[PDB]
Amino acid sequence: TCPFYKKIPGTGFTVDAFQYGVVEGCTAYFLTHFHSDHYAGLSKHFTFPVYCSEITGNLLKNKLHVQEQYIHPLPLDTECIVNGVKVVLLDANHCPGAVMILFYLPNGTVILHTGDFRADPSMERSLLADQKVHMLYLDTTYCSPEYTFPSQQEVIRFAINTAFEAVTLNPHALVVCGTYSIGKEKVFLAIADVLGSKVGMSQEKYKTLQCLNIPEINSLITTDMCSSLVHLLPMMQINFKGLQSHLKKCGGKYNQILAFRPTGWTHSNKFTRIADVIPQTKGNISIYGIPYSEHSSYLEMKRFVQWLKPQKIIPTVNVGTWKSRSTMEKYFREWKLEAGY
Ligand code: NI
Numbered sequence: 001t002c003p004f005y006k007k008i009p010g011t012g013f014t015v016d017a018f019q020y021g022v023v024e025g026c027t028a029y030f031l032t033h034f035h036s037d038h039y040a041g042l043s044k045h046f047t048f049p050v051y052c053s054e055i056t057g058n059l060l061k062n063k064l065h066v067q068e069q070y071i072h073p074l075p076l077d078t079e080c081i082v083n084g085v086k087v088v089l090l091d092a093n094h095c096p097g098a099v100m101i102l103f104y105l106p107n108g109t110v111i112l113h114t115g116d117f118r119a120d121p122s123m124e125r126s127l128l129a130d131q132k133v134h135m136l137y138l139d140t141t142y143c144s145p146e147y148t149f150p151s152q153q154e155v156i157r158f159a160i161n162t163a164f165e166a167v168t169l170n171p172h173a174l175v176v177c178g179t180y181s182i183g184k185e186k187v188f189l190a191i192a193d194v195l196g197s198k199v200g201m202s203q204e205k206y207k208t209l210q211c212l213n214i215p216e217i218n219s220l221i222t223t224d225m226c227s228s229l230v231h232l233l234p235m236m237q238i239n240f241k242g243l244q245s246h247l248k249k250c251g252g253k254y255n256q257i258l259a260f261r262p263t264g265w266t267h268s269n270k271f272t273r274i275a276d277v278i279p280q281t282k283g284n285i286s287i288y289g290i291p292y293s294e295h296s297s298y299l300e301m302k303r304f305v306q307w308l309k310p311q312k313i314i315p316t317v318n319v320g321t322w323k324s325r326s327t328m329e330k331y332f333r334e335w336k337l338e339a340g341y
Contacts, residue, residue: 032115033098034059055097058211092117095183096212113137119296119304136310141295149291163191173256178238192230200228262292309341
């Protein structure tokens with residue numbers, strides 16, 4: 001049974017609610033982005049209207065085989081009427097095709113559902129500038145002040161400089177980057193651009209990237225692994241055993257691996273600056289954990305909410321424990337007392 005924080009009151013709508021069977025009263029199912037916890041339950045047998053971005057609809061059609069007649073892609077930054085209700089989709093600064101959804105209810109209430117997002121000051125100049133929001137359904141993944149990490153631009157600078165130094169010292173070093181979902185494509189694309197290489201990957205991963213409307217993508221990726229010195233592998237294979245095994249398969253073309261695991265936050269964030277990050281090494285294999293996040297830090301989240309000044313906040317992450325819920329509610333009240341709304 002569908003939880004309350006996935007339902008939009010005063011509408012026939014749900015958000016990211018495909019694993020509950022036929023939800024009573026739902027006339028339109030919105031999907032914020034193509035991450036498995038959010039699409040869980042969709043397949044070629046689904047026969048209700050799904051509303052989403054163009055990119056998310058390419059993934060639904062090609063990867064999950066949802067039939068075309070049930071996919072309703074909407075343009076971003078554009079007022080659209082869905083089943084009698086005005087909606088807008090906004091870029092969420094999460095993975096490719098991820099959106100926030102603004103709902104203009106028939107009684108005058110305005111609701112923002114962030115989906116998953118990484119808050120940014122650029123959002124203060126979107127269509128959100130123009131009107132009041134009564135209710136905020138908030139991605140609270142890192143809602144505690146211990147969650148700090150650098151900007152995505154600092155992290156990519158570290159990765160490019162690390163990879164270029166290693167491969168210039170040793171032209172026979174291979175770079176490997178871990179992946180298990182869409183998102184974080186700048187990691188491997190920026191490294192391959194500084195090295196003058198295409199990124200090599202499995203046919204299944206190439207297929208996924210071909211759905212993402214990334215400009216000039218045919219110039220940047222390939223299934224011919226032998227032609228490439230940046231390889232993508234499943235995240236589970238980014239360990240010394242898995243990497244040793246991969247190096248065997250390369251036919252003595254390479255004699256060293258430098259590997260990246262883009263995680264979100266790890267508690268090595270509570271002590272170490274990006275500048276000071278060092279790898280784990282065994283023999284001719286080195287593995288870097290880099291803190292590339294596609295969710296808001298605590299400070300980014302607090303700035304966005306203090307700017308928006310919602311009347312009510314509904315968390316959508318960390319809702320299963322009483323300790324999490326009480327922690328989040330305390331911070332919401334601090335923020336409101338500090339800013340004066
Ligand atoms: Ni996500």
